[PDB]
Symmetry: C2
Subunit: 158 residues, 2 copies
């Protein structure tokens, strides 16, 4: 299946899954499981949630990794501080990449921002192969995260 | 790989994993982070597993928390299925041959999680695609792992409130 097909399907599956469920933790864990087992050549997929000061890991699929990430530090901290998606083809060349993120060869991080500008956290996907993610994954991952923010986080906050 | 390495028994392996679990959660205050990391640690330390994670009691029924594996059940009523049976009976369930959730599961162990004051926290659920993957040594080992999580993550956070 092409990337365009996979992300179109994932977007509707994700919306179906989280709209029918109030609990944010359930929705974050099921979302991580859905994406992780639908895309090949991944070794990590999951959430970090902002605690008012820094990122703190939430539900994820993969091996134990970073537990806390300061804003500005590494790919995830850079995404949270700049509020810009990070598409990294070679994590070992990303300036300031952090030790607990060493299992990843390439990475995509989408910042999650509430409608009122509050930093929610980041969505982080890692691969053990080089240049796994391109700008179509940028489009596709961001569409999945918009579903999550609108129909899981924004709902529970209200 | 490397057959000449030391080959530990189930008791020793679960004891080593309990110390790792203790070290992983001891100093982190956030309960959801510890639950996510604990699920990841156990799932990747034991072989022949296809699911490992938490369902948390919301006061009425079980609601899935952090887990490793494909999407499974989201909500489970008390008394329904292996996990709901564990939560209601407050008894550990060991199933050698598998209603719901992870379809590929052939054997399963569910450990109820109960607070110091008797509150039902939820359950810890692990599945294998192999028949009779879990025996009474796995039963004892999983219960010891869950004591670490309840003591050094859940009860720790509750007592600070």
């Amino acid at each position: 299946a092409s990337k365009a097909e996979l992300y179109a399907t994932l977007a509707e599956q994700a919306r179906s899954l989280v709209e029918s469920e109030p609990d944010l933790i359930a929705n974050a864990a099921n979302f991580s499981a859905l994406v992780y087992h639908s895309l090949d050549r991944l070794n990590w997929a999951g959430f970090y949630f902002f605690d008012g000061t820094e990122l703190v890991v939430g539900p994820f699929q993969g091996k134990p990794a970073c537990v806390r990430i300061a804003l500005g530090k590494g790919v995830c901290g850079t995404a949270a501080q700049t509020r810009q998606t990070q598409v990294v083809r070679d994590v070992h060349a990303f300036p300031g990449h952090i030790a607990c993120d060493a299992a990843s060869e390439s990475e995509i991080v989408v910042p999650l921002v509430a409608a009122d500008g509050t930093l929610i956290g980041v969505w982080d996907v890692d691969s053990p192969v080089a240049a796994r993610f391109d700008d179509e994954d940028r489009s596709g991952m961001e569409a999945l995260c918009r579903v999550f923010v609108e129909h899981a986080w924004q709902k529970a906050r209200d």
